[PDB]
Write an enzyme that holds these catalytic residues in place. Structure first.
Site, PDB file in Angstrom:
ATOM      1  N   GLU A  35       0.822  -1.206   0.000  1.00 37.62           N
ATOM      2  CA  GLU A  35       0.000   0.000   0.000  1.00 37.62           C
ATOM      3  C   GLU A  35       0.860   1.262   0.000  1.00 37.62           C
ATOM      4  O   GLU A  35       0.556   2.210  -0.722  1.00 37.62           O
ATOM      5  CB  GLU A  35      -0.952   0.003   1.198  1.00 37.62           C
ATOM      6  CG  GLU A  35      -2.070  -1.032   1.111  1.00 37.62           C
ATOM      7  CD  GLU A  35      -3.232  -0.601   0.222  1.00 37.62           C
ATOM      8  OE1 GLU A  35      -3.257   0.560  -0.232  1.00 37.62           O
ATOM      9  OE2 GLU A  35      -4.112  -1.439  -0.037  1.00 37.62           O
ATOM     10  N   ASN A  46      -7.619   9.545  -5.164  1.00 37.38           N
ATOM     11  CA  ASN A  46      -8.466   8.676  -5.962  1.00 37.38           C
ATOM     12  C   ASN A  46      -9.370   9.510  -6.858  1.00 37.38           C
ATOM     13  O   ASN A  46      -9.539  10.717  -6.660  1.00 37.38           O
ATOM     14  CB  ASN A  46      -9.290   7.767  -5.045  1.00 37.38           C
ATOM     15  CG  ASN A  46      -8.416   6.943  -4.125  1.00 37.38           C
ATOM     16  OD1 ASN A  46      -8.601   6.942  -2.905  1.00 37.38           O
ATOM     17  ND2 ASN A  46      -7.429   6.269  -4.700  1.00 37.38           N
ATOM     18  N   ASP A  48     -12.550   9.610  -7.234  1.00 34.68           N
ATOM     19  CA  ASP A  48     -13.711  10.252  -6.624  1.00 34.68           C
ATOM     20  C   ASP A  48     -13.342  11.477  -5.760  1.00 34.68           C
ATOM     21  O   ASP A  48     -14.214  12.020  -5.061  1.00 34.68           O
ATOM     22  CB  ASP A  48     -14.466   9.223  -5.790  1.00 34.68           C
ATOM     23  CG  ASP A  48     -13.736   8.867  -4.509  1.00 34.68           C
ATOM     24  OD1 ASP A  48     -12.496   9.017  -4.453  1.00 34.68           O
ATOM     25  OD2 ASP A  48     -14.393   8.407  -3.563  1.00 34.68           O
ATOM     26  N   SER A  50     -11.498  11.519  -3.051  1.00 35.01           N
ATOM     27  CA  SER A  50     -10.969  11.104  -1.763  1.00 35.01           C
ATOM     28  C   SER A  50      -9.467  10.858  -1.876  1.00 35.01           C
ATOM     29  O   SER A  50      -8.905  10.813  -2.970  1.00 35.01           O
ATOM     30  CB  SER A  50     -11.675   9.846  -1.272  1.00 35.01           C
ATOM     31  OG  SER A  50     -11.306   8.744  -2.069  1.00 35.01           O
ATOM     32  N   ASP A  52      -6.090   8.510  -0.046  1.00 30.05           N
ATOM     33  CA  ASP A  52      -5.578   7.473   0.842  1.00 30.05           C
ATOM     34  C   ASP A  52      -4.376   8.006   1.605  1.00 30.05           C
ATOM     35  O   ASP A  52      -3.533   8.701   1.031  1.00 30.05           O
ATOM     36  CB  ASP A  52      -5.188   6.228   0.046  1.00 30.05           C
ATOM     37  CG  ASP A  52      -6.337   5.684  -0.747  1.00 30.05           C
ATOM     38  OD1 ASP A  52      -7.479   5.816  -0.270  1.00 30.05           O
ATOM     39  OD2 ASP A  52      -6.106   5.120  -1.828  1.00 30.05           O
ATOM     40  N   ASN A  59      -8.564   5.723   3.695  1.00 33.17           N
ATOM     41  CA  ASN A  59      -9.263   6.546   2.722  1.00 33.17           C
ATOM     42  C   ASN A  59     -10.178   7.559   3.405  1.00 33.17           C
ATOM     43  O   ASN A  59     -10.948   7.213   4.309  1.00 33.17           O
ATOM     44  CB  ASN A  59     -10.084   5.658   1.789  1.00 33.17           C
ATOM     45  CG  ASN A  59     -10.806   6.449   0.740  1.00 33.17           C
ATOM     46  OD1 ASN A  59     -11.983   6.744   0.888  1.00 33.17           O
ATOM     47  ND2 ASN A  59     -10.099   6.813  -0.326  1.00 33.17           N
TER      48      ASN A  59
END
EC number: 3.2.1.17
Length: 129
Positions: A35, A46, A48, A50, A52, A59
């Site tokens: 990750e 991301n 959308d 958002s 991480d 998130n």
């Protein structure tokens, strides 16, 4: 902070992650590896809108506030920036609530794509624990 492999495994073990909800230590190390490459400061945005955050790429749509994901939840009740600290405590406790949410560690795409069903124990091999 970029953790060493064994270093992070010991830190994660101390914070109650080994066997948490049935997921052995190697699973969390493996997930953190893919990750964030063990980097507490990793962020990734991301599509959308958002983002991480941190060692386990938590998130902002559901788990932390970054003041920038509209219509989002803050179910870990933390600023996303706290997830970037060299101390992984906030990341760990938030992940504990993520992994209890129903879907287990499938909540992390790199775990399901790169750790799940592999020899995750190899990720703590050679470590003094």
């Amino acid at each position: 902070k970029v953790f060493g492999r064994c270093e992070l495994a010991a830190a994660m073990k101390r914070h109650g992650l080994d066997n948490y909800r049935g997921y052995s230590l190697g699973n969390w190390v493996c997930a953190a590896k893919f990750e964030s490459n063990f980097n507490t400061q990793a962020t990734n945005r991301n599509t959308d809108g958002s983002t991480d955050y941190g060692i386990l790429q938590i998130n902002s749509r559901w788990w932390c506030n970054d003041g920038r994901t509209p219509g989002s939840r803050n179910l870990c009740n933390i600023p996303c920036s706290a997830l970037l600290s060299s101390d992984i405590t906030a990341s760990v406790n938030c992940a504990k609530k993520i992994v209890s949410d129903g879907n287990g560690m499938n909540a992390w795409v790199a775990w399901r794509n790169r750790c799940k069903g592999t020899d995750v124990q190899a990720w703590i091999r050679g470590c003094r624990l």
